[PDB]
mmCIF file of C-alpha atoms and ligand atoms in Angstrom:
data_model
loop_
_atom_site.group_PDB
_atom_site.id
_atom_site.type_symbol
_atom_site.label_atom_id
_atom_site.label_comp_id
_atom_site.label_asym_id
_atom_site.label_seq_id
_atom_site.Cartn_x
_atom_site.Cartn_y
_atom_site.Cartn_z
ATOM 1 C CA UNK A 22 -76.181 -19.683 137.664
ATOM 2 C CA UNK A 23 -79.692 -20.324 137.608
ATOM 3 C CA UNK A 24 -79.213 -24.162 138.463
ATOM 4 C CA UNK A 25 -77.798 -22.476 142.065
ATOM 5 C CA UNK A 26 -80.474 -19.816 142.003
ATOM 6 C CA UNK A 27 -82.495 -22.949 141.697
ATOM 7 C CA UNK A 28 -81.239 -24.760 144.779
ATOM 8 C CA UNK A 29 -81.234 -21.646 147.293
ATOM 9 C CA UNK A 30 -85.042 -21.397 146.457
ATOM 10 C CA UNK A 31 -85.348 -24.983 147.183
ATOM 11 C CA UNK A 32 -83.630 -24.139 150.407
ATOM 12 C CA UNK A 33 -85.917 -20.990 151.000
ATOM 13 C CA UNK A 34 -88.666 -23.322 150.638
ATOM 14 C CA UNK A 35 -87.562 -26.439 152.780
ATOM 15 C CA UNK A 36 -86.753 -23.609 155.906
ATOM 16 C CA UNK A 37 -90.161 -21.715 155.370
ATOM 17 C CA UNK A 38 -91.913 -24.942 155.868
ATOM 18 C CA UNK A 39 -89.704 -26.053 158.800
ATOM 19 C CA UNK A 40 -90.718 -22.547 160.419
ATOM 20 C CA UNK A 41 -94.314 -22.837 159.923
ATOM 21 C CA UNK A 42 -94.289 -26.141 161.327
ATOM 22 C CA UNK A 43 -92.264 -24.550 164.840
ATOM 23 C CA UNK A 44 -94.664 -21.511 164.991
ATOM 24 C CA UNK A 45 -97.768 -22.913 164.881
ATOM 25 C CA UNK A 46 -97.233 -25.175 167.793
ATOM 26 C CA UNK A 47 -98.611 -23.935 170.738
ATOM 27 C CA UNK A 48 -95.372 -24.830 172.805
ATOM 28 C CA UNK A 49 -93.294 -22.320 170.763
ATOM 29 C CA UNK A 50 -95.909 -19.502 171.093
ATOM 30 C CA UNK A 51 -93.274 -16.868 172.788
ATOM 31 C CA UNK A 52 -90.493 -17.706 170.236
ATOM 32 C CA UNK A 53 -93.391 -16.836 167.081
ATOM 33 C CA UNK A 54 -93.090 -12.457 167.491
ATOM 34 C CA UNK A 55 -89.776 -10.543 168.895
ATOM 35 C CA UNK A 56 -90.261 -9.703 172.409
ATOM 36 C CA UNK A 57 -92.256 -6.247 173.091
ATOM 37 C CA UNK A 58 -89.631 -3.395 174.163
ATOM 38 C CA UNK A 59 -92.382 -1.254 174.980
ATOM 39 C CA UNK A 60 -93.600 -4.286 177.574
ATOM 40 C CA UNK A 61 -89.703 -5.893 178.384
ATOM 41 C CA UNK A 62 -87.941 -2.553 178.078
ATOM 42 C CA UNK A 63 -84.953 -4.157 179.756
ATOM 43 C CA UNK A 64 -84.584 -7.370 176.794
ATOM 44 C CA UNK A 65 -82.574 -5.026 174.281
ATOM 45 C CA UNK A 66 -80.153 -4.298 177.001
ATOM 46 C CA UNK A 67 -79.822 -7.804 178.285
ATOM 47 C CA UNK A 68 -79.976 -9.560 174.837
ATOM 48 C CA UNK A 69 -77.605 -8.348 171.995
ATOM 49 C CA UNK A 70 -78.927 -10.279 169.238
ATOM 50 C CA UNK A 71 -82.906 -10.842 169.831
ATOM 51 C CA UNK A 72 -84.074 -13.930 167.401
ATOM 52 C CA UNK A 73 -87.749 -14.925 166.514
ATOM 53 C CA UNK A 74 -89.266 -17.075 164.285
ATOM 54 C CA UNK A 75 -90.890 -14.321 162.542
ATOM 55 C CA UNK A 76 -87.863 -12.725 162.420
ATOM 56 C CA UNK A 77 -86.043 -16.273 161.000
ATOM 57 C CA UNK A 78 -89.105 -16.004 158.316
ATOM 58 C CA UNK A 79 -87.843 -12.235 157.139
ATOM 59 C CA UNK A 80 -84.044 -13.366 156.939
ATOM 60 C CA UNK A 81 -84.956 -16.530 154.974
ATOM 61 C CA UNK A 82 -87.168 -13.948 152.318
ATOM 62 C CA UNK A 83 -84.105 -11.636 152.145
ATOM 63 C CA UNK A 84 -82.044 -14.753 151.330
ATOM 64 C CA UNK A 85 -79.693 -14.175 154.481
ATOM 65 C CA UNK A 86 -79.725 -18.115 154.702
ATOM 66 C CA UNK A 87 -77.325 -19.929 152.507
ATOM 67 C CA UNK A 88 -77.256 -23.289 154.114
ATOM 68 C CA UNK A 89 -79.286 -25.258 156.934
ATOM 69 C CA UNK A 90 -76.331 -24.684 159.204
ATOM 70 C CA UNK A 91 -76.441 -21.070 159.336
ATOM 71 C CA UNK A 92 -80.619 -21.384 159.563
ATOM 72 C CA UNK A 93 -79.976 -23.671 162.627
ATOM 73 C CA UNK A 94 -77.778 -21.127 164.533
ATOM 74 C CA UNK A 95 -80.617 -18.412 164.351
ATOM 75 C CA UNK A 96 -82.142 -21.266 165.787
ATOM 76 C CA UNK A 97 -79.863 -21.782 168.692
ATOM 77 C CA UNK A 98 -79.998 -18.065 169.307
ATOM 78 C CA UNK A 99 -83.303 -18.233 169.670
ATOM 79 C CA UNK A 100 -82.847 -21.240 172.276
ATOM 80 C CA UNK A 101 -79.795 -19.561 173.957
ATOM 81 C CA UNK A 102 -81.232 -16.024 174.306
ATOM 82 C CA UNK A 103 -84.429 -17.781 176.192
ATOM 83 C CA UNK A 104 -81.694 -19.502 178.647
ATOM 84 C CA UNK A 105 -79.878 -16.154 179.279
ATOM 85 C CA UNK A 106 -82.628 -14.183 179.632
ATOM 86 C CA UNK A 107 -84.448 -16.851 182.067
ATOM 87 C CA UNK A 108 -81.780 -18.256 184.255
ATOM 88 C CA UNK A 109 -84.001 -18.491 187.395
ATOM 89 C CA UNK A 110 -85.724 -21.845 189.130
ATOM 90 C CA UNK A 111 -88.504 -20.609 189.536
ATOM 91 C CA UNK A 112 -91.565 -22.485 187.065
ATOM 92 C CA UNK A 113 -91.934 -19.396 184.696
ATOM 93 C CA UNK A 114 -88.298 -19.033 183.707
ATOM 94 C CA UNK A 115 -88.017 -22.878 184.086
ATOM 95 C CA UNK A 116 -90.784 -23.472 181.486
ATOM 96 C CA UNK A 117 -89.469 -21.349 178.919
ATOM 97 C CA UNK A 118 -86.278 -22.464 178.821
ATOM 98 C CA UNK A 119 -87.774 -26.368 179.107
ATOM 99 C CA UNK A 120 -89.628 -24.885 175.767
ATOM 100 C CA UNK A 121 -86.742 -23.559 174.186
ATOM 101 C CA UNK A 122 -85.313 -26.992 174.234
ATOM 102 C CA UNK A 123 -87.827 -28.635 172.777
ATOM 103 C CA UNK A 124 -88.024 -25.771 169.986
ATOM 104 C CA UNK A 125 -84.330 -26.330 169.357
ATOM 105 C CA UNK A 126 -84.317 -30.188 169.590
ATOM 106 C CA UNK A 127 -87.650 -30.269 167.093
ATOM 107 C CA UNK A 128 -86.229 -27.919 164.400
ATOM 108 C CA UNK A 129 -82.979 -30.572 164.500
ATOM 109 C CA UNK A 130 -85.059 -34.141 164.445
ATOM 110 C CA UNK A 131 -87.015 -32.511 161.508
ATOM 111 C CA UNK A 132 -83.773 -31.478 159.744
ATOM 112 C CA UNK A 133 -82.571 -35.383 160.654
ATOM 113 C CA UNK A 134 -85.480 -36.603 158.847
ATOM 114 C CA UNK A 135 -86.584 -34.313 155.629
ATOM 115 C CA UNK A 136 -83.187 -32.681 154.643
ATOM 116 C CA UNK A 137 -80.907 -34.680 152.306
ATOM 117 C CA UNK A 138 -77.397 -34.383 153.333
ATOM 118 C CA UNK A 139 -76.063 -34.166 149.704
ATOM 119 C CA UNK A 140 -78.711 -31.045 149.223
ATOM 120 C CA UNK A 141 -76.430 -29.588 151.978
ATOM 121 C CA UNK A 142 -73.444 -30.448 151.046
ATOM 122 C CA UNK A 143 -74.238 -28.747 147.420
ATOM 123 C CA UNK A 144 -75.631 -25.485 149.310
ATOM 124 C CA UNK A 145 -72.339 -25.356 150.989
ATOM 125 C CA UNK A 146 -70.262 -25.698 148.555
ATOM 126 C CA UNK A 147 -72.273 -22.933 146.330
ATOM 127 C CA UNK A 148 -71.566 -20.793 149.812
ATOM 128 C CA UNK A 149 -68.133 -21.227 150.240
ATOM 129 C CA UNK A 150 -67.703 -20.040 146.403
ATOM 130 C CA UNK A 151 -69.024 -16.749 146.381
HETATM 131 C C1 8WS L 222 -94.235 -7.852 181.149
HETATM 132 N N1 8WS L 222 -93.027 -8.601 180.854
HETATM 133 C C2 8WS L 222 -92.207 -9.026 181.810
HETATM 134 O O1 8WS L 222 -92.403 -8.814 183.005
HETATM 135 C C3 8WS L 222 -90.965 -9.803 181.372
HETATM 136 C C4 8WS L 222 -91.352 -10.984 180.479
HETATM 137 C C5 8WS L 222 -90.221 -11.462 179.583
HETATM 138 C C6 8WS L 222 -90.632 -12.568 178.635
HETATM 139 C C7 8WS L 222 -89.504 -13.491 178.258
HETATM 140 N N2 8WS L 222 -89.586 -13.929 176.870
HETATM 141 C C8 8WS L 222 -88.560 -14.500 176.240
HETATM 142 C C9 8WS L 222 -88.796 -14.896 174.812
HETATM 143 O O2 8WS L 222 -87.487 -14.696 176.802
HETATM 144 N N3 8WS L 222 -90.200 -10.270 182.520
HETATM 145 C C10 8WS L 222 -89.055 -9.632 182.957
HETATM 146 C C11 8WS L 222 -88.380 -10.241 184.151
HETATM 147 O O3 8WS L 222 -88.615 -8.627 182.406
#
């Protein structure tokens, strides 16, 4: 209906601005563009599902997010693919992954705060119906 078509855009919306907010911290810098295979040619082998926020951005336009949930496990890929790929102790792979954390942990406490848990509720509801 269009009252459902009404509350996916709403959605669409709310995760748009939740993304903008992530990528233009300067923390979250590496998690804004997919990595470079021509510069990491060794990423696609290593890392099956690659996640971005620019990528997140081009699923929510092609409406491939139906509820927050689903948003937040591109989310956790994101945060997961930066642990797997990073594993060392050394500072670089330690900072990114310290990052990661804090992208992952800052998309949540913003969801906490700004989405109503009844909008939710209704998205996935209209979800589990189609
Ligand atoms: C020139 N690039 C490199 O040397 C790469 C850099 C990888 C960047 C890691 N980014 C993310 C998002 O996990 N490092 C190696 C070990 O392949």
């Amino acid at each position: 209906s269009m009252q459902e078509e009404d509350t996916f855009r709403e959605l669409r919306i709310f995760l748009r601005n939740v993304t903008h907010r992530l990528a233009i911290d300067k923390r979250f810098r590496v998690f804004t563009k997919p990595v470079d295979p021509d510069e990491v040619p060794d990423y696609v082998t290593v890392i099956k599902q690659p996640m971005d926020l620019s990528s997140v951005i081009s699923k929510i336009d092609l409406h491939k997010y139906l509820t927050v949930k689903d948003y937040l496990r591109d989310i956790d890929l994101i945060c997961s693919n930066a642990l797997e790929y990073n594993p060392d102790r050394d500072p670089g792979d330690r900072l990114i992954r310290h990052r990661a954390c804090a992208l992952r942990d800052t998309a949540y406490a913003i969801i906490k705060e700004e989405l109503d848990e009844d909008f939710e509720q209704l998205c996935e509801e209209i979800q589990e119906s189609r």
